[PDB]
Symmetry: D2
Subunit: 213 residues, 4 copies
């Protein structure tokens, strides 16, 4: 009955969130670049997860993902906007323009295009609205060496969450963000996302940070 | 089987947290200044909550609360360090020294003394450790007018959480903090605290903020 | 012609700020617990600094400091609210109640009482208003081990600055804060404070952090 | 004798910083898209400013700017990495992919490419190192409505500053950031940048925020 779209759903925290949302009774659309790993996530769910190979850096592929979801399930209540690539851990001035662009497109442009499509879908549905949960950094309180593209784009996600919360309110869209760091088992990020998605629309975890050890 | 001490348990979020922890199967000690309101919380729980009238600004009363808890339940796994008073909303220079001292003692000294006693108890028990959850501000992203004592002491709680996490690690003590603000139903703060207390000791929500509307 | 009160002026950053403000042409009142070290700061200034032994944790002593300043110089344009004591670096639960109270009184109550007296004086003078610069932490981005009283009270100063900025605006009082940390020569904190005090009242450095190395 | 490169130097804060650095005795290279406005900045300086029309979103144009600077002046001690465009204030889902890409390229890719070229130049020169000052947001404590591309990319600049400080240390490169907001005369941002550039390399203002009124 509540419907989620989970990006990066073929691996890691995306897979764990999709499995945990389905266990909590959501209908789930699984978005990611490769069908094989999406299929294994759907097998784990063992219900009616929908696999949707998607390039979230591509506006048309993104639109197609939400259309497929609404066609199958009827609406979209939650988006877990989950991306996380890094460039190689090399001196910053050795990064090529393409290595830079790959991290910006994956970590920042993908989440922004999915947030735009979520606004289009959520504002149109009835009852109106929903929630977007953005997956932030895995090094929250301290950047790793040689990480400027990853650190800049995950900080950009904090700005995107803030503007999405402000701009979503008119459409009954809430937005919050989860970050992790180290002083981690993906199950704990998934249970936190399930918790955040459990709240009614007028209460919202805007930011939370979970620390390992 | 897991044991919690909840301060401010006779009202508001303290009562809601105590009721929610007991519903999740915790043994609960209810600490607060007045027995009457503690009794009503224990009636709501309708199990074996322990009422312990306590002045958390007083070291001996604090020690007595933890001793009563360990005597009854055998150990203390979670402390919800919950205080929240304000001075009158008047020009800052009109505040009397006693009105200032009342907010510092209640909002900062109480939580610090309970954290010290929690370290004494948690480091001594077997298995060792536990978690302390500090209740932060209700105006997280923007201070209200005429609120310097409340705003300074709730910001102090953020510093206390950070030092408690660092200093607790050697004793297997984790510490995290919850804050709220407004762009709220106490049930949502209670379910967030239950969530935070649900995690094993090596994963910890160090900070989370829930926003109304 | 612009007049400053500098607390902790007998040593360290307080002395360096007082010397730098006087070098920039301010009249300076030097506040601190011991006359000897205040005298040496006044000798360094070698002009007309006013030594005022003061206990900033005491409301009457604070009032006396501002009265002495207005008597001598005619008004108070800038307050450098500068305190910074720590408790011993020992396990938190070994701190005595008096060791805790000493850090709260020095690092939080002193600055709050000086801010109240500054509001009384600044709102009354003509032209009205002025600026208060609060000296924050020396470990800004990471607390040291065994530092809960210092870390909680310097975080409290951030809350005090925020409320002082909001509440001061009606009186043409601006408030900002300086913090330092380490990835330091007191001359750099002093030149930053001089910079902050140089701005007209409608532009204000609300926060700045200077990092060593 | 100290040499600065100032981007966006044909207008607004970029022009004011270039004029103020030259007034403080720096040699200045003026980078911006249009020669006309660069010329007017150079006329204001009325000394030996070097105009260098540059597209900072283009790696070759960026390299050419630093090469022109080193050819003329001999080294580069300070970079003011200054960009700031917004997309139209319209519903987020109405933004075209090109309007999004324009803000990411200008506000995030330009500063990243200039930081890479600054590392190449600063690490190679003798004495080695220098400082990079990134111009952050003009709405620091609260995003404006309809501003997700601007808010995300200025938050990204905070991440870039943090990684640049960490990664620059081995090359004696310091990095800090200035932000502004409103509870402003460009002269105050320029005097703050001059202040930040005045410090020796082992002390660094990593972040400062100036608030209007
Ligand atoms: Cl990050
Ligand atoms: Cl607060
Ligand atoms: Cl601190
Ligand atoms: Cl911003």
């Amino acid at each position: 009955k509540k419907i989620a779209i989970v990006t990066g759903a073929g691996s890691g925290v995306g897979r764990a969130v999709a499995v945990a949302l389905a266990g909590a009774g959501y209908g789930v659309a699984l978005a990611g670049r490769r069908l094989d790993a999406l299929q294994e996530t759907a097998a784990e769910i063992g219900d009616d997860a929908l696999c949707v190979p998607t390039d979230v850096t591509d506006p048309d592929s993104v639109r197609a993902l939400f259309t497929a979801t609404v066609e199958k399930f009827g609406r979209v209540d939650v988006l877990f906007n989950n991306a996380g690539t890094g460039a190689p851990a090399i001196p910053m001035e050795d990064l090529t323009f393409a290595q830079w662009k790959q991290v910006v497109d994956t970590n920042l442009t993908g989440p922004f295009l999915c947030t735009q499509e979520a606004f289009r879908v959520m504002k149109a549905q009835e009852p109106r609205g929903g929630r977007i949960i953005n997956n932030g950094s895995i090094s929250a309180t301290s950047p790793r060496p040689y990480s400027a593209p990853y650190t800049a784009t995950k900080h950009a996600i904090t700005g995107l969450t803030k503007s999405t919360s402000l701009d979503g309110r008119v459409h009954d869209i809430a937005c919050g963000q989860i970050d992790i760091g180290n002083a981690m088992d993906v199950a704990h990020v998934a249970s936190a996302v399930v918790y955040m998605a459990s709240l009614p629309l007028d209460a919202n975890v805007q930011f939370m940070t979970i620390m390992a050890t």
